[PDB]
Amino acid sequence: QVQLVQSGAEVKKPGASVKVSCKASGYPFTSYGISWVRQAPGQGLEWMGWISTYNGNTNYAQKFQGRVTMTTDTSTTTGYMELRRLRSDDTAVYYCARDYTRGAWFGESLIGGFDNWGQGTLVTVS
Template identity: 50%
Template structure:
């Protein structure tokens, strides 16, 4: 947990290729609508990849060009929670997923649980 900000992320998910999965990132300790929320993917043994970011204030999103086809970021501002959905899962989606608020995105990432390969 970074500084005085709390992030609670949903538990590990096991899915089959072709399925969808939706991850949650519950936050507290800062004004949710004041900062972008970033999502990051790390496949074991590889460099981290930036998936994109969402502005909770207006729902505006920016995606990495390699991620925008199957990845969808949303927020539920009423419960200060960010979501990442991946559709049409592939084996290469087996990774650790991180969410981070904008001011922390260059200082460290908070881990989402692993999505094992089937």
């Protein structure tokens, strides 16, 4: 009965930043990581990065290495992502998912995938 609940749609101006939350329930928060994937209209799935809910370690995609910051809060079992310096090309739906592709405690690769996904948060830049 795992669920991921994301914030609603946001509208931002070029140069602005957006903060997208993802509330998790139905499982031990510190046993699984959190990954973020975005999908622009008409496009496929693009990986943004991963964070461990246990030790705060991160692994970012090169494309967002200097733009995206990911954090977690284990007291409210909620993940957060912030994307800085938004451009018109960043209009997309941003999804959170439960990560079982990398361990949260050891950082090693696991045999798995992204099983639970949130509904997605639409971010528009104009």
